[PDB]
Paper text:
To gain structural insight into the architecture of Rsu-1, we first crystallized and solved its crystal structure by a single-wavelength anomalous dispersion (SAD) method using a single selenomethionine (SeMet)-substituted crystal. The structure of Rsu-1 was refined at 1.76-Å resolution to an Rwork of 17.3% and an Rfree of 21.7% with good stereochemistry. The N-terminal cap region consists of one α-helix (residues from 5 to 15) and a loop, whereas the C-terminal cap region of Rsu-1 comprises the ninth β-strand followed by a helix-turn-helix motif. Amphipathic structural features in those N- and C-terminal cap regions shield the hydrophobic core residues in the first and last (eighth) LRRs to stabilize the structural integrity of the LRR domain, respectively. The terminal helix (residues 240–251) in the C-terminal cap region then folds toward the convex surface of the LRR region. A parallel β-sheet with nine β-strands from eight LRR motifs and the following segment composes a characteristic concave surface in the LRR domain of Rsu-1. The structure of Rsu-1 superimposes with that of SDS22 with an RMSD of 1.49 Å for the 195 equivalent Cα atom pairs. Although Rsu-1 comprises two distinct variable sequence lengths (23- and 25-residues) in the LRRs that resemble in part those in the plant-specific (PS) subfamily in the LRR superfamily, our structural analysis strongly suggests that Rsu-1 falls into the SDS22-like subfamily rather than the PS subfamily.
Ras suppressor-1 (Rsu-1) is a leucine-rich repeat (LRR)-containing protein that is crucial for regulating cell adhesion and is involved in such physiological and pathological processes as focal adhesion assembly and tumor metastasis. Rsu-1 interacts with zinc-finger type multi-LIM domain-containing adaptor protein PINCH-1, known to be involved in the integrin-mediated consensus adhesome, but not with its highly homologous family member PINCH-2. Rsu-1 does not have catalytic activity but its primary sequence analysis indicates a leucine-rich repeat (LRR)-containing protein that implicates for protein-binding functions. We also showed that Rsu-1 can be assembled, via PINCH-1-binding, into a heteropentamer complex comprising Rsu-1, PINCH-1, ILK, Parvin, and Kindlin-2, which constitute a major consensus integrin adhesome crucial for focal adhesion assembly.
Numbering used by the authors: 2 to 251
The structure:
């Protein structure tokens, strides 16, 4: 409805904290006159546009807590993105990211990271990625991960972890350290066994979610999935499963 000029000018003159520029055909953030003068705004929505980059100028939006780039064509993020010290919610879903910039893990307030439908893999993650220990929800579904790095175990505030439809061949035993987890999505990968340490998690309730269908599970595990998720968790806690799991690797 409103022009981009009016959105910027009204945000500034009335000290308004949220700016909605979703679905406006924007191909370059530098084209939006005055956008980077809004050092006070807390929410910027640029979903459903045609961005292919995010300029380093993003660092001038120092008050941002919510940044939504869902469904653009973004191919890389500037390293300056990690200077957003108030950023709590970052939605980069449905873009074309193959890497995250060095220092990305330096974001001190990040709670929700949506990276669904990109082209990320374990090699995409910078060295300091798992210093993001404020994270409570990490959405990585429909990416290209083949393994999950063991430092995932550092993210002990995580309540939601989505790894749906990646290419995972294993889960690290360090997943067992995520004792606040309520939702784990691992359906649609290439998983054959589960680390016994996943049995440390209670994902059996109506309140918890464990989605794990559509994996090439070994026969004993597949048999337990037929009986129900609680049966899977009991099985992988057993000493006999620990025995066979150790032998199956070798």
């Amino acid at each position: 409805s409103k022009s981009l000029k009016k959105l910027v000018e009204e945000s500034r003159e009335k000290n308004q904290p949220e700016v909605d520029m979703s679905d406006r055909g924007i191909s370059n953030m530098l084209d939006v006159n005055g956008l980077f003068t809004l050092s006070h705004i807390t929410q910027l929505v640029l979903s459903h546009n045609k961005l292919t980059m995010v300029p380093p100028n993003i660092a001038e939006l120092k008050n941002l807590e919510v940044l939504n780039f869902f469904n653009n064509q973004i191919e890389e993020l500037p390293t300056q993105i990690s200077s957003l010290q108030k950023l709590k919610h970052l939605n980069l879903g449905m873009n074309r990211l193959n890497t995250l910039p060095r220092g990305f893990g330096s974001l001190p307030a990040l709670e929700v990271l949506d990276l669904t439908y990109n082209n990320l893999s374990e090699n995409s993650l910078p060295g300091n990625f798992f210093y993001l220990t404020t994270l409570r929800a990490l959405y990585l579904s429909d990416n290209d991960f083949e393994i999950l790095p063991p430092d995932i175990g550092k993210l002990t505030k995580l309540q939601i972890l989505s790894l749906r439809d990646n290419d995972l061949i294993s889960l690290p035993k360090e997943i067992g350290e995520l004792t606040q987890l309520k939702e784990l999505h691992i359906q649609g990968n290439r998983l054959t066994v589960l680390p016994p340490e996943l049995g440390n998690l209670d994902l059996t309730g109506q309140k918890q979610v464990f989605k794990a269908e559509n994996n090439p599970w070994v026969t004993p595990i597949a048999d337990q999935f037929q009986l129900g998720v609680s049966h899977v968790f009991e099985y992988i806690r057993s000493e006999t499963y620990k025995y066979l799991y150790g032998r199956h690797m070798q």
